Design a binder for this molecule. Sequence first.
Ligand code: 6PB
Length: 341
Amino acid sequence: PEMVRGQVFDVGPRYTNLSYIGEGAYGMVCSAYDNLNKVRVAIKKISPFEHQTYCQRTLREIKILLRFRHENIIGINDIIRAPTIEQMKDVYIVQDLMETDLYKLLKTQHLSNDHICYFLYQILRGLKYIHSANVLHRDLKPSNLLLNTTCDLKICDFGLARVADPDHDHTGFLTEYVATRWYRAPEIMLNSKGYTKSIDIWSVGCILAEMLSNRPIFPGKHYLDQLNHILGILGSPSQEDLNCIINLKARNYLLSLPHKNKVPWNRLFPNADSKALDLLDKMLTFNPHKRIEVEQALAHPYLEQYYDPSDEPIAEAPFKFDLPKEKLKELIFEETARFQP
Ligand SMILES: Nc1nc(-c2cccc(Br)c2)c2[nH]cnc2n1
């Protein structure tokens, strides 16, 4: 097999001329020349079979991406693995090659208002499709938003996704761990398991803020610090919003804090489009029940140049609804079979 940086990267005769890109959540990522389609592609090596948790995440990533088909979602072009379950040790996922991600872009490039508008439109268009399938992404952040040379945007990494379950969302105080810290909604720390669509809208709001200034809006230094940053900008919650939190530990924590004032968005972002800030406020709303939903966000005046519900498709087949690693390996083998030989 071909080797890269001293490790096996076995993508067979179809894919050649490998180049190392870097390390992602799953391991090594390379580009390669697709000798069939005559174009360069991205390839991700996954090695999950020794651990049940890794197998769970890998099955989610593959099953969801194979069912979805949408312009603003990365999808999967091919999957490479051994012909037998016995010989299968690694799985390689082949995807369209992109130029960059939004994390890298924000480190060095100022975005025009037109680019912010276009990126936000594409994020929400993809998210409408995901939510219409009854699925929560649960880890939206700039590094999971990929861009090609013409600024087409693709949402990636569904390994942390779940089927929505609003009836079973309530839990206790300081127990939950959903999403990446800076993009994590306040209720995750208070009383929520992250099983409702509002979790994703919060993350998109955080991304919009970061596009406006090139800096994360709520840069918590650790898990417990994150709520300090959120409240330092939104200010103290209203009585009505507190009344929506029945859990006493969570409500009493908030009641114990000194008063904090809201910091006006236009003071944080004096060069921003006023319509962008109105939409930002609606996405970064403390009460998840009052927070704007994806279809409302698409219809906001900020996005009027792009909005067209007939060109914002939904999923044909929503997902309506303890396995050992051995059983999960079998499921991964079966899910990837369509790409043999
Ligand atoms: N250039 C590039 N990188 C990645 C990528 C994605 C995640 C991590 C790392 Br390191 C690289 C891609 N994923 C799909 N197409 C891709 N194109």
